[PDB]
What does this fold into?
Amino acid sequence: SFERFEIFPKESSWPNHTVTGVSASCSHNGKSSFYRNLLWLTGKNGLYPNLSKSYVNNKEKEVLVLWGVHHPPNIGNQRALYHTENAYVSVVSSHYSRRFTPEIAKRPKVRDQEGRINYYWTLLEPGDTIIFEANGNLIAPWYAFALSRGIITSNAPMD
Amino acid sequence: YVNNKEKEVLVLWGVHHPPNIGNQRALYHTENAYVSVVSSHYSRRFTPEIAKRPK
Amino acid sequence: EKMNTQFTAVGKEFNKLERRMENLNKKVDDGFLDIWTYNAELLVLLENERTLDFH
It folds into this structure.
């Protein structure tokens, strides 16, 4: 089974943050858009207050939640976007922990881009909890794939 | 310590991550600390990462 | 009818690093692919003689 539901609501859980975020690299019929399962966050009114959201696996199936980090190309972009020189991202669960840090540095251009993004993933067993604590350079999850338990490659048609 | 024996030695240690910065100030009277172990081939530098965690 | 079959898979992929795992997987696959043919050839190569002798 591959039931897909919403972990956070777009219109409710982010009142003080600009949910809208787009980039030209992920073009869609000319108009610029973003992924359909991630939620870019920026700062509004010059402020990016530290945020803390939690989720409890109330279902009976495993939950596969993806998030990301954002590495800006230069310190000027970091100051313009998140209004902070340094920031950290931490996710804590029953058996998981990490403290990512957005490492700014000049990088060669690929796909007409200079910044980068790192995607991570994890599995939450039923009854467990997950906590997101960060104060900058985060791409919060929006949807999860509550899966419950081969792959080939060919160009042949289907009938 | 110097391994003044014939056999190998299996030495275990640990690190302590306090739950909040309050415990960090109370117990050790410091904000940041570093635990480092060095041997002939081993070397690391752990850092106590304070953060709120589920019970 | 002495042979039974069951749900399995063969295809596995790896990244640039950890080439030792890929070498080991190739080695085991080649070993099985050799053993099975060497058995299957001799089986029939003996049966087509025994049957003719009996007849």
In short: The longest helix of chain A spans residues 75-82.
